[PDB]
Design a protein around this ligand. Structure first.
Ligand SMILES: [Zn+2]
Ligand SMILES: [Zn+2]
Ligand SMILES: [Zn+2]
Lengths: 56, 92, 119, 147, 49, 56, 187, 119
C-alpha cells in the first residue's frame, strides 16, 4: 500500500492480520483481508459455469 | 491554499502516505491491553496523509457498524441487501 | 563483440576474408569501404548468464520518498543516510541482497557475505 | 527403481541422468565463430595446449568454438569424450572436431567445415543445439528424486 | 526531454497547488527510469489527501 | 483471560523475529536454497510457515 | 433530499453507468504463450482526443522465442496485411543510416546486450537502403503514395497526423522497441 | 578397444600441458602404477591437482538440485484423524459456498493421509 516503504518484506505488509476479530482489523489489515476473501466469491463464479456442464 | 491535493492511482505509486495524522507523526520517548495493535511510523518521508481511512468504503459498507470486526465476506453480502431493504426513498 | 559501422555511408559491417594475405576484413554492402579486423572474435552466443545487478541511480534517489532509510555506514564517507532496494533484475531466481546508497558521496555498497562487487 | 536398488541414494541420479533428456544446448555456455586459418595454431591463447595434443597422436578456415559448463557436466554425469564423440558421430566424416580434457579449467570444442562457409556454418550452429541429444529420452525435461 | 528535473517537478507541483494547473491533472516522476509522466486524460479515478 | 491475551501478543511478536531473523539472514545471502527451489521461493515458505504456526 | 445526477426519459428515471476501460495512448509490453512464434509484444492504443476518434492499434512484436536463432523485431500497421521489420519503417520514416537508427533504439552504447539483440534485426532490412524503397515495400508510383498517408494519418496517429514530424514519431517507435526488449532481457 | 587406447593415452598426455605443471614435473618420479590407473578413473581427481575438491563438491550441489520440494505444514493439537486416530493434521480454509454460510476448511491427516471437509 502507498502507506509502505518500497521493498518491505515484513509480515505486516505481505498481508498478516494480527488482531483478533474482537479487537478489529486496521486499514491495511482490513484491505488485504478483503482481497483475500473476495477470492472464493470468484472461483465460485467460474466454477459454477463449468460445474453444471460436467454434472449433466 | 495547497493544503490538500487530488492524487490518482498512477501518481499514488510515487508517494508515501500516513494513516493517522496524529499517531503516525510524533517521536518515541503503557499501551492499552484492550485496543488493537497498529504497527509503527518507521519512516520520515510521508508526502501525504489520509483524511480518514473509512473513506476506502462505498455507500453500502459505510452503513455497516464495525465492518472491522467481521469476516470480509459478511460485509460483502450486507452490501447487497441494504438494497433489498425498506425505508424512505425520498419524502415526496 | 562491440562491432562497428563504416564512415561516410554509415551502415552495418559484414566480414569477408583476405585469401592471399590470410586475414580478417569487415565491410559495406552498400558502399565500397573495407576496414581491417579489430579482433578474431566474430560472434558470441551467451546462453548461461550470471547477473547480479544494481539500478542506475539518477542521483536524485534521495528525493524519492518511496524508499526506506538505514543507519549503517558506508565503507568510505561513513555517513548515516542510506536508501536501499533490490536487484532491478526482474528475475525469479534472483537473490535477496541489499544495495544501499550514500546521500553524501553516491556509493553503491552491498551487505553481501560471499561474493564481492565493485560494479 | 528396480527391486534391490532402492535406498541406494547415488543409484538415483545414476538413472536420473539416464532419463532426463539432455541436449548439447543444456551444457553449452556459448558458441563463437572465429577466424583461425592455421589448423596448427589458434589465434586464441587459452586454446593452445589443446591443439598441440591432437596432432602428435583439405579443411576450412572458419572456426566454431563451444565453451561448456563444468557444473552442468556432473549434475547429469558426462565426459568431454562422450559429448564431442556424439557430435562427431552426428555429422560423421565431413566436419573436423577436437576437445580439451576433463582436467582443463576451461572445457571446449573446436571444429571447422570441409563457396560460402559462414552461412553453412550456422545452420550447423543450430543443428548442433536443438537436434543433438546426449543422455536421456525425448520430451522428458526435468526429473527428480523423492523418498 | 529535460535535464535537471528535480526543479521542473516541484515547480509544477506548486504550480498546481495554487490553481494554475488544474488540481485534477496528474504528473509523476519516475526517477529510477528517468521519465516524467503528466496526465490530463478524462477518466482517472482520484481521491484527496 | 487477560494474561492469555498478552501471552498471545508476545507469542505473535516472538513469531515476528523468528521471521525477521530469516529476513536479514536472507538479505545477507545466508539462506540455503533448499530443495524448495528458488531462494526467494524458499524464503516465503519459511515465513508463512512461521506465522501460520503462530496463529493456529 | 433527492440528489439528482440522473435523467428522466419517457418518464422513468434512467442512470448512465460508469464504464471502465483500458486507458489509452500508452505503451505496454506483454509476454506471449509458449506455443507461438511471437516472443514478446509492446502495444499502444491510439485514439485522437477530439475528432472522429480513430482506434487503430500499434503492434511491435518480437519473433523467435528465447533461444532460437534470428530473433527478429517486426511490427504491424493499420491497413497493412503483413507485418514489417522496425527497420524498413525506420528508414521509411527518413532514417536510412543504421546505427543512427540504433541511436533511436539504444540510449547507452555501454549496453551491448540490447545492442547485440538488434544485430539480427538490421540484417533483416538490409534489402533496403533509402527512404524511396522504404515506402515502396508497403503495398509502382501508386503504392509509394498510399504508404505516406498511412504513416501520417494511421501510424501512431496520436501525437499528430499532420506531416513534418517524422522525427518525433520515430523516437517513439524506438521508445517502444526499447521498452519491448527491456523485458526480453529480464530487466 | 581401438582409439579407447587413443583416448586414454592421449587425453591424459595432453593434460600435462595444463596447470598441473608442477605436478607434471614430478612425472618423475611416480610409479607406473599412476598411469596404468589413468586408463581407468579417469585418473582426473588423482591426476587433476586440486579440483578433485571442487569437482567432488560440485556433485553435491547437483544432488541438491535433484530433490523435490517438501510441503511443510503445521499440525494442530485439537484436530484428529479418522483412521490413524492421531492429532497431527493440517488444514486450509477456502470459500466454497456463497457469502451466507462461509468457510469450508479442508483437513489432511499429515501422517496417514485422509482428507475431508467441515462446512
Ligand atoms: Zn559504408
Ligand atoms: Zn559514502
Ligand atoms: Zn492422520
Amino acid at each position: 500500500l502507498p502507506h509502505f516503504s518500497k521493498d518491505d518484506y515484513s509480515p505486516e505488509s505481505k498481508g498478516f492480520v494480527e488482531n483478533s476479530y474482537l479487537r478489529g482489523l486496521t486499514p491495511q489489515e482490513f484491505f488485504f483481508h478483503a482481497m483475500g476473501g473476495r477470492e472464493g466469491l470468484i472461483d465460485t463464479a467460474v466454477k459454477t459455469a463449468e460445474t453444471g456442464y460436467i454434472q449433466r | 491554499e495547497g493544503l490538500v491535493e487530488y492524487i490518482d492511482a498512477e501518481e499514488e505509486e510515487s508517494i508515501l502516505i500516513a494513516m493517522q495524522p496524529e499517531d503516525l507523526e510524533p517521536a518515541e520517548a503503557d499501551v492499552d491491553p484492550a485496543k488493537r495493535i497498529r504497527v509503527s511510523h518507521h519512516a520520515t518521508t510521508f508526502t501525504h496523509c489520509e483524511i480518514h481511512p473509512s473513506m476506502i468504503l462505498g455507500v453500502a459498507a459505510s452503513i455497516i457498524p464495525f465492518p472491522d470486526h467481521n469476516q470480509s465476506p459478511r460485509n460483502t453480502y450486507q452490501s447487497a441487501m441494504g438494497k433489498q431493504a425498506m425505508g424512505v426513498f425520498l419524502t415526496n | 563483440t562491440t562491432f562497428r559501422f563504416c564512415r561516410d555511408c554509415n551502415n552495418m559491417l559484414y566480414p569477408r576474408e583476405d585469401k592471399e594475405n590470410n586475414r580478417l576484413l569487415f565491410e559495406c554492402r552498400t558502399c565500397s569501404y573495407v576496414e581491417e579486423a579489430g579482433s578474431p572474435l566474430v560472434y558470441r552466443h551467451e546462453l548461461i548468464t550470471n547477473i547480479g545487478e544494481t539500478a542506475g541511480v539518477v542521483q536524485d534517489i534521495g528525493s524519492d520518498p518511496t524508499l526506506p532509510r538505514s543507519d549503517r555506514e558506508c565503507p568510505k564517507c561513513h555517513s548515516r543516510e542510506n536508501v536501499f532496494f533490490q536487484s532491478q533484475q526482474r528475475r525469479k531466481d534472483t537473490s535477496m541482497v541489499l544495495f544501499f546508497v550514500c546521500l553524501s558521496c553516491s556509493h553503491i555498497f552491498t551487505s553481501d557475505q560471499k561474493n564481492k562487487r565493485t560494479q | 527403481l528396480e527391486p534391490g536398488h532402492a535406498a541406494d541414494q547415488e543409484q538415483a541420479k545414476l538413472i536420473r541422468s539416464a532419463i532426463e533428456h539432455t541436449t548439447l544446448k543444456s551444457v553449452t555456455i556459448a558458441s563463437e565463430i572465429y577466424y583461425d586459418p592455421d589448423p596448427r595454431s589458434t589465434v586464441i591463447p587459452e586454446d593452445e595446449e589443446i591443439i598441440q595434443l591432437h596432432f602428435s597422436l583439405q579443411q576450412s578456415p572458419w572456426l566454431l568454438r563451444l565453451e561448456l559448463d563444468r557444473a552442468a557436466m556432473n549434475d547429469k554425469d558426462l565426459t568431454m569424450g562422450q559429448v564431442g564423440e556424439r557430435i562427431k558421430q552426428t555429422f560423421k566424416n565431413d566436419l573436423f572436431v577436437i576437445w580439451s580434457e576433463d582436467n582443463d579449467e576451461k572445457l571446449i570444442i573446436r571444429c571447422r567445415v570441409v563457396a560460402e562457409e559462414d552461412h553453412m556454418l550456422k545452420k550447423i550452429e543450430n543443428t548442433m543445439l536443438e537436434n543433438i541429444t546426449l543422455r536421456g529420452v525425448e520430451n522428458i525435461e526435468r526429473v527428480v528424486m523423492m523418498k | 526531454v529535460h535535464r535537471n528535473p528535480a526543479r521542473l517537478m516541484e515547480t509544477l507541483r506548486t504550480l498546481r497547488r495554487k490553481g494554475d494547473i488544474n488540481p485534477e491533472v496528474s504528473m509523476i516522476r519516475d526517477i529510477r527510469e528517468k521519465e516524467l509522466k503528466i496526465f490530463t486524460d478524462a477518466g482517472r479515478v482520484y481521491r484527496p489527501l | 483471560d487477560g494474561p492469555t491475551m498478552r501471552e498471545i501478543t508476545e507469542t505473535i511478536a516472538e513469531a515476528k523475529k523468528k521471521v525477521l531473523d530469516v529476513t536479514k539472514e536472507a538479505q545477507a545471502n545466508l539462506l540455503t536454497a533448499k530443495h524448495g527451489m528458488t531462494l526467494r521461493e524458499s524464503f516465503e515458505d519459511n515465513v508463512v510457515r512461521f506465522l501460520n504456526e503462530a496463529r493456529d | 433530499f433527492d440528489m439528482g445526477g440522473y435523467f428522466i426519459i419517457n418518464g422513468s428515471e434512467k442512470v448512465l453507468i460508469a464504464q471502465e476501460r483500458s486507458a489509452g495512448n500508452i505503451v505496454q509490453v506483454f509476454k506471449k504463450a509458449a506455443p507461438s512464434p511471437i516472443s514478446h509484444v509492446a502495444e499502444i492504443r491510439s485514439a485522437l482526443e477530439k475528432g472522429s476518434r480513430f482506434i487503430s492499434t500499434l503492434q511491435v512484436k518480437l519473433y523467435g522465442r528465447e533461444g532460437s536463432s534470428a530473433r527478429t523485431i517486426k511490427a504491424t500497421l493499420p491497413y497493412i496485411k503483413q507485418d514489417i521489420p522496425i527497420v524498413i519503417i525506420f528508414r521509411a520514416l527518413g532514417i536510412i543510416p543504421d546505427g543512427e537508427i540504433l541511436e533511436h533504439i539504444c540510449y547507452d552504447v555501454n549496453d551491448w546486450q540490447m545492442l547485440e539483440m538488434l544485430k539480427p534485426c538490421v540484417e533483416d532490412g538490409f534489402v533496403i537502403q533509402d527512404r524511396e524503397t522504404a515506402l515502396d515495400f508497403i503495398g509502382k508510383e501508386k503504392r509509394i503514395q498510399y504508404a505516406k498517408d498511412i504513416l501520417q494519418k494511421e501510424f501512431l496517429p496520436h501525437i499528430t497526423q499532420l506531416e513534418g514530424f517524422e522525427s518525433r514519431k520515430a523516437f517513439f517507435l524506438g521508445y517502444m522497441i526499447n521498452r519491448l526488449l527491456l523485458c526480453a532481457l529480464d530487466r | 578397444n581401438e582409439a579407447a587406447y587413443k583416448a586414454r593415452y592421449r587425453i591424459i598426455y595432453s593434460n600435462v600441458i595444463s596447470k598441473n605443471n608442477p605436478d607434471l614435473k614430478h612425472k618423475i618420479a611416480n610409479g607406473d602404477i599412476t598411469p596404468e590407473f589413468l586408463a581407468t578413473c579417469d585418473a582426473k581427481d588423482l591426476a587433476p591437482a586440486p579440483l578433485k575438491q571442487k569437482i567432488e563438491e560440485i556433485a553435491k550441489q547437483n544432488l541438491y538440485n535433484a530433490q523435490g520440494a517438501t510441503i511443510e505444514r503445521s499440525v494442530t493439537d485439537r484436530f484428529t484423524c479418522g483412521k490413524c486416530k492421531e492429532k497431527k493434521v493440517s488444514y486450509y480454509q477456502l470459500q466454497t459456498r456463497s457469502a451466507d454460510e462461509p468457510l469450508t476448511t479442508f483437513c489432511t491427516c499429515e501422517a496417514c493421509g485422509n482428507r475431508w471437509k467441515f462446512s
